[PDB]
Amino acid sequence: GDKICLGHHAVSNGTIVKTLTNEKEEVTNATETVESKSLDKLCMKSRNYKDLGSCHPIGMVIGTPACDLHLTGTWDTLIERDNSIAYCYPGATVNEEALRQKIMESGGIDKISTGFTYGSSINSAGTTKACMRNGGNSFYAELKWLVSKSKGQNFPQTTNTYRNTDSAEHLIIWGIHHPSSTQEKNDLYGTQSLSISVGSSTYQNNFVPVVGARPQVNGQSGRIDFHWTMVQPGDNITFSHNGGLIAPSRVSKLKGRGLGIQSGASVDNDCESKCFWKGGSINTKLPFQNLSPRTVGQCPKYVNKKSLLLATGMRNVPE
Amino acid sequence: GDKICLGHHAVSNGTIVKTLTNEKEEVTNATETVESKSLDKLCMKSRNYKDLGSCHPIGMVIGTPACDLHLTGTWDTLIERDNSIAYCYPGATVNEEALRQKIMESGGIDKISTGFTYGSSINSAGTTKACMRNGGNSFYAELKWLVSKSKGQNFPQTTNTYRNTDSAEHLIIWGIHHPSSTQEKNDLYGTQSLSISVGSSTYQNNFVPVVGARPQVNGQSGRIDFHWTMVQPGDNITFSHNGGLIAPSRVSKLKGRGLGIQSGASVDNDCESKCFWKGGSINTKLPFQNLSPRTVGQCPKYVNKKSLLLATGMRNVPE
Amino acid sequence: GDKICLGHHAVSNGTIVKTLTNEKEEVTNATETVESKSLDKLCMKSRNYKDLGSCHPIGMVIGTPACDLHLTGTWDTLIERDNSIAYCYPGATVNEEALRQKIMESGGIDKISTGFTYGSSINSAGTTKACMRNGGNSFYAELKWLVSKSKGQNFPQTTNTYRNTDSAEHLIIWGIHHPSSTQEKNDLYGTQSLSISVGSSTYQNNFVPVVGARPQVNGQSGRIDFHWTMVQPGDNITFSHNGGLIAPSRVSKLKGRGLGIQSGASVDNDCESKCFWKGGSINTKLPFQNLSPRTVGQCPKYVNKKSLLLATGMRNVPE
Amino acid sequence: GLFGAIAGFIENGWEGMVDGWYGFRHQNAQGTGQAADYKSTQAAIDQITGKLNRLIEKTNTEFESIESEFSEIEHQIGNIINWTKDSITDIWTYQAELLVAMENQHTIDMADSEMLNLYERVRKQLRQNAEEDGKGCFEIYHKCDDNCMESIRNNTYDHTQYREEALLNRLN
Amino acid sequence: GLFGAIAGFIENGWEGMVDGWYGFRHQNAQGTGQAADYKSTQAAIDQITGKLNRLIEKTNTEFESIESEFSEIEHQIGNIINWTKDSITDIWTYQAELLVAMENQHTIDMADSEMLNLYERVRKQLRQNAEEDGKGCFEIYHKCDDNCMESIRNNTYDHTQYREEALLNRLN
Amino acid sequence: GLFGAIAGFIENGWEGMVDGWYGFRHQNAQGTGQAADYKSTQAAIDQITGKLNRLIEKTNTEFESIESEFSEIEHQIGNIINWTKDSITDIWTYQAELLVAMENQHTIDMADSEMLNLYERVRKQLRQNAEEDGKGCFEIYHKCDDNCMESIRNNTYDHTQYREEALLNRLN
Numbered sequence A, B, C: 001g002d003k004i005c006l007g008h009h010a011v012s013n014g015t016i017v018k019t020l021t022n023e024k025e026e027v028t029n030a031t032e033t034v035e036s037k038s039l040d041k042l043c044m045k046s047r048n049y050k051d052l053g054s055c056h057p058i059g060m061v062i063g064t065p066a067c068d069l070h071l072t073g074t075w076d077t078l079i080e081r082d083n084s085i086a087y088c089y090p091g092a093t094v095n096e097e098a099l100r101q102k103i104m105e106s107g108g109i110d111k112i113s114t115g116f117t118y119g120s121s122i123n124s125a126g127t128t129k130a131c132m133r134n135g136g137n138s139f140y141a142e143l144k145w146l147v148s149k150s151k152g153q154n155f156p157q158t159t160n161t162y163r164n165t166d167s168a169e170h171l172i173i174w175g176i177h178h179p180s181s182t183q184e185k186n187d188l189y190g191t192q193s194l195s196i197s198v199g200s201s202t203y204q205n206n207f208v209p210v211v212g213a214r215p216q217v218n219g220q221s222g223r224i225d226f227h228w229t230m231v232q233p234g235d236n237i238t239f240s241h242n243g244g245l246i247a248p249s250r251v252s253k254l255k256g257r258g259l260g261i262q263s264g265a266s267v268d269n270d271c272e273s274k275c276f277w278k279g280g281s282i283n284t285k286l287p288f289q290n291l292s293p294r295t296v297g298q299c300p301k302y303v304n305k306k307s308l309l310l311a312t313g314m315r316n317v318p319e
Numbered sequence D, E, F: 001g002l003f004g005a006i007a008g009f010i011e012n013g014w015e016g017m018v019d020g021w022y023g024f025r026h027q028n029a030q031g032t033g034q035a036a037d038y039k040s041t042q043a044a045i046d047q048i049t050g051k052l053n054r055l056i057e058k059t060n061t062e063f064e065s066i067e068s069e070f071s072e073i074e075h076q077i078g079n080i081i082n083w084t085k086d087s088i089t090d091i092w093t094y095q096a097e098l099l100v101a102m103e104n105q106h107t108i109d110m111a112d113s114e115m116l117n118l119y120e121r122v123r124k125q126l127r128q129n130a131e132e133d134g135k136g137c138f139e140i141y142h143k144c145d146d147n148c149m150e151s152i153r154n155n156t157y158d159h160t161q162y163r164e165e166a167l168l169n170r171l172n
């Protein structure tokens, strides 16, 4: 008899995949579902980015010299680098991390003046060689180191209140100076008990500068501790102080939304991407990726597999 | 030959669904799996609810005037509204949010008296125009503003200890008065260094009232810092003070379990529900819902889909 | 015609499982996927474990009597029990929980001497009946209760700084004594204002011992507040004080990584396990378990099912 | 599809059939008829009901608020919550999308299967007395009046009774 | 079910069959017999073992305590942990419930399939020389002794060899 | 496998076939030939493409860093994050593993099905004019030249035209 036979194709070039019943199935073809390749750069095409270079986000709000180019601006993307400078005079901010995060998600900052005036017996322009600009000693651009105008004299009881007349919350930072010696305290402020209280309608806190001997950084054995809040629209914030306050001259308004990236990778304006990590930028249509759990933007989900092949052909049965 | 033919049904009114292969499959029928409808109300049928209205949960524990109807009670459901009042004399409580949460999960509060007595030279019934009742000046119902009985006199060193003789932990709140002027401090308490220490077997802390000016609310430029702990059964808590303590007259026992709802929706006693959100109440047998990730009770899981149709018929092939 | 018939097997011994369609399908056989059995012991075979017994991890760092066997060591597994002792003289440590966690995650501790010397007028070997060893009064092994050598004498202004010359961060703890009476303060230290400041490059704080009465524990009505930091390699930490400091004699270096287990179950050295919980040890090849969400090590995932049967046979159709 | 019947060798559905999901349709000397199959229609419906009973009316577990709708909370802890919540929404939406996709794939392929089973049933009933058209029909090589057609529909048709004539007409 | 054999046209299982999962049963002039099919039984068992090997043996990742069992802590951060842990438990219990449900659906339908495949194998092997009963049996229109029955069971049955007469007895 | 064709009764693939996935291959008086089936090959490819279009191209949701890459964060809150992240990685790696496994099981079984559907198509076309070999071939009991072979491949073959001869050669 004559005959007609039905059959399928095969390849010698077979591929192995996993199923519900078998861990090695040859199929004719298959495709990778887990992205393993990343670009060694930050793909910034068609984004208003801000590369902070040596500036740390917090320095933008207090006005460290390293951050002079970045005291104001708008951006949809902020880039932090690893040994960026936040502080000139040694110190620390309370809830630094929260503050760092609010700025990195902000998409822009504007500076509004406090209008605080002090009157004589206060010298409101203290400077230090820890915060150089040039020529000479300077201080944080957004704050004022207030000091008795006369060396030994007691610092006057003073009161300053800032009033938010905008319709958006403003961020206020201030510092408290912790001097290195009882002599230094006496010279900058009184020989009197120091006390600083800060109060709004929704916030209330008290501080005491504290004297003591400490290592030098870098620089100085004294310190500044920064503290901050949000002032609601229409609210007033009052500072009551008699020495030790590092007062705000400008407050900050954070503007909208932006993507904050922490990376040392260099910027590239010719590729686009919606996904970033420390090692750069990830651009793929695959649903999963191999590279890092710590990513930002619109990212495929991180998995612990080197490879997951999806079959794109039938079972392979060679001749 | 005579013929018999086998076939299936179809419909002119076809429906589209998704499969593994195809994003538009016509089937004869299908049913929605994602709930999208919510009720504009809080379905309280057959629940012992408590609507706090203008009272903030924290005001129930210190006894703000707005919370007089809610100083004790049992409930299986507590409702908070958005501009509820916690404080009459301005202040803030440490770990407010934890405290607010413990109460919203509590299902009832009882008030147990501290029995603290003071002896003369102390006037233990200070009142203020900031906390009005009927008639005249009042104070928080659960606390006592202790003050020198004679205006300029030093406040006596005093000691009060509360002992938990129940078999459940009790919540103790107390305040520390931060006065607005050295004059006001001098008039309420001594001209002496103030110091307040609080100690149990499992808790220990020291406080210092701090003088300073803060915006008037609304009212006053002084403030009160509220602090709290749990006192274990059988444990004692002692207060050592010489002016500045706002002492507890009653402590609180939180009773069991309840569902805490934060919503502005109005209550309805004719529908029932096990699921609630800010926008009201959600009542469905479907496994998913569309309305909010922020829900409380026994809720379907939130998803980012408008619609997910489950096929309840075969593939639809019309004539 | 002669007949050949095809058929499958069945059993009288049928089992019920769930499918997509049916909640009750008889199949010929099935197997459990959710582990429900645990061992009431801690399987420690082939691990360098340390069972702390009555010692609390924090006591290892300050040197409570109960912890004398555990002041140094290396381990890959640390076991805590429920009413372990941390303190002899009553007190509390700030951020106790973080400290407890750092130790339970540590895999070993070494003690490095501070080398602080004091000179006469200071008696640096204060002891108490609250911290007994053999024979007589003692104190925490890693700290020194400094006291005026003469009963009524003012305590000398003193300064000690410790320098980390290792290449790993060291943990320093210190205490601050809050005495029970002005009489006790006067006898241990001066009749003078007490003040203690502590400062490094990364840390800076001041303390004031506070006199006051608190319940006897049990023992004493005074208290100690423990405070701690990490001293970075190369950094100095200085203590300035005039009475009230409980000084470190030794600091701690935490060494690598280890599994911290909290359980009351007794140890067994002849089973092995990678998964532990309060109730003991879980050893299974099944992907899920029934016993606790709170487990440590390499554990199957917790589920809320008593049982989930996987079919290992066909549909069962009996005769 | 998978079983090659619905949208396979049967060209299309019958919109006139409203008594059931699968069914019969005949033509003989006395005219035409239409009728639904109970056993196959019920088989399909019961498994869809089974699916619906598993997804609907499950009991959910209790969750309390971990955030405040009204008092903004510490920003660091807020971000950790937002992150965890969005991370969980992504998981549930994906699962839901997967669940429905695969259940639907199965429902459709199930329905195709029940149609094939009904075909195979009838084919075996008619033994050598009929031949498959290829379009879903069987041509019967004997004269099959309305009672004969009913016998096929209620599984009482005896092929033996018509075998000798069927074979004779197949051999011409 | 899906493939219409198990709980389909084969009305029930054989409890006497304990050598294997699928098998044969015959009747000819020399009496009756029963015998299991190796290839089909092994095909089904191996895919169950495949499933079992995937669900057993997975390597788990290390976790540390983020709570204290004994010095119960602080409340705000606790509530966030409870929430996150219950949220995850819901996810794993659901997945488990889905995993098993669908694997079971597949196991059952797989087993049905291997039974159909065994039927189809034999049907094609007998060519023109047998007819399907409709109940899972083939009626053989030639005289088939115990060796002939074995040929069918190991796919060595030669259609050519009995065709002459099979046809002859079908011609009636 | 499930449908018993690929790695079933068809013993192997054709590597010479590069025009499509499924196809025909003949032998008659004029020699041999090979040709691919469009409809079945397209049916299989389109469903693989469908699968690929669901897994690729998905839109993701936006996430911010809750960790710092550069500054040490509080150890307690860090541990809670590590826990939550590892907990979520476990979930996604498991799901991915499951997704692919089951999609692959389905792809393979789909492809088998299309091969069966092509078989069944041709079987029904040839009516009583051919017989199944059992290994994927049909033996034609009439003389089928190259135009006749094409008629089968383009669904234009009329069985009635060759029936009388076919039956005659089936009967002797």
Ligand SMILES: *[C@@H]1O[C@H](CO)[C@@H](O)[C@H](O)[C@H]1NC(C)=O
Pocket (backbone or CB within 6 Å): A013, A015, A028, A029, A030
């Ligand atoms: C072999 O298979 C790969 C897919 O794995 C395919 O893309 C490629 O074209 C093939 N190569 C050759 C030379 O046939």
Ligand SMILES: *[C@@H]1O[C@H](CO)[C@@H](O)[C@H](O)[C@H]1NC(C)=O
Pocket (backbone or CB within 6 Å): A029, A030, A031, A312
């Ligand atoms: C293998 O995979 C992809 C699609 O998944 C395809 O583009 C590629 O050409 C394939 N290779 C062959 C030879 O089919």
Ligand SMILES: *[C@@H]1O[C@H](CO)[C@@H](O)[C@H](O)[C@H]1NC(C)=O
Pocket (backbone or CB within 6 Å): A163, A201, A234, A235, A236
């Ligand atoms: C301070 O802010 C309050 C709103 O809380 C406002 O009523 C008041 O007018 C402001 N101060 C003055 C002097 O207007």
Ligand SMILES: *[C@@H]1O[C@H](CO)[C@@H](O)[C@H](O)[C@H]1NC(C)=O
Pocket (backbone or CB within 6 Å): B013, B014, B015, B028, B029, B030
């Ligand atoms: C039309 O079909 C829909 C579902 O697609 C069904 O709910 C409705 O009852 C049907 N109505 C008519 C008139 O066919």
Ligand SMILES: *[C@@H]1O[C@H](CO)[C@@H](O)[C@H](O)[C@H]1NC(C)=O
Pocket (backbone or CB within 6 Å): B029, B030, B031, B312, D052
């Ligand atoms: C559509 O499905 C629902 C249940 O899923 C059912 O109540 C209704 O009968 C269906 N509509 C039609 C026309 O069958």
Ligand SMILES: *[C@@H]1O[C@H](CO)[C@@H](O)[C@H](O)[C@H]1NC(C)=O
Pocket (backbone or CB within 6 Å): B163, B201, B234, B235, B236, C215
């Ligand atoms: C204080 O509480 C303790 C329990 O810790 C108890 O033994 C003691 O009697 C109490 N003291 C007083 C004065 O009641």
Ligand SMILES: *[C@@H]1O[C@H](CO)[C@@H](O)[C@H](O)[C@H]1NC(C)=O
Pocket (backbone or CB within 6 Å): C028, C029, C030, C031, C312, C313
């Ligand atoms: C039951 O199924 C299990 C699956 O592990 C298998 O080991 C065992 O042999 C089976 N027993 C019976 C009686 O089928």
Ligand SMILES: *[C@@H]1O[C@H](CO)[C@@H](O)[C@H](O)[C@H]1NC(C)=O
Pocket (backbone or CB within 6 Å): A215, A216, C163, C201, C234, C235, C236
């Ligand atoms: C104090 O610390 C600095 C580094 O921070 C170091 O240079 C110096 O040697 C230290 N002081 C002493 C006396 O060792």
Ligand SMILES: *[C@@H]1O[C@H](CO)[C@@H](O)[C@H](O)[C@H]1NC(C)=O
Pocket (backbone or CB within 6 Å): D147, D148, D150, D151, D154, D156
């Ligand atoms: C099929 O069943 C009916 C009852 O539903 C029965 O009365 C009838 O006699 C049967 N059909 C024929 C052709 O006998």
Ligand SMILES: *[C@H]1O[C@H](CO)[C@@H](O)[C@H](O)[C@H]1NC(C)=O
Pocket (backbone or CB within 6 Å): D075, D076, D078, D079, D082
């Ligand atoms: C999530 O929390 C952040 C603060 O960390 C807040 O800005 C944001 O509004 C919250 N999410 C939404 C949807 O509001």
Ligand SMILES: *[C@H]1O[C@H](CO)[C@@H](O)[C@H](O)[C@H]1NC(C)=O
Pocket (backbone or CB within 6 Å): E074, E075, E076, E077, E078, E079, E082
């Ligand atoms: C969960 O944590 C809360 C404190 O936030 C605690 O009250 C509760 O007991 C914990 N859950 C269980 C099961 O105990």
Ligand SMILES: *[C@H]1O[C@H](CO)[C@@H](O)[C@H](O)[C@H]1NC(C)=O
Pocket (backbone or CB within 6 Å): F147, F148, F150, F151, F154, F156
């Ligand atoms: C098969 O179809 C083609 C159309 O492409 C037609 O030209 C051809 O004539 C058909 N077959 C035969 C045998 O004629």
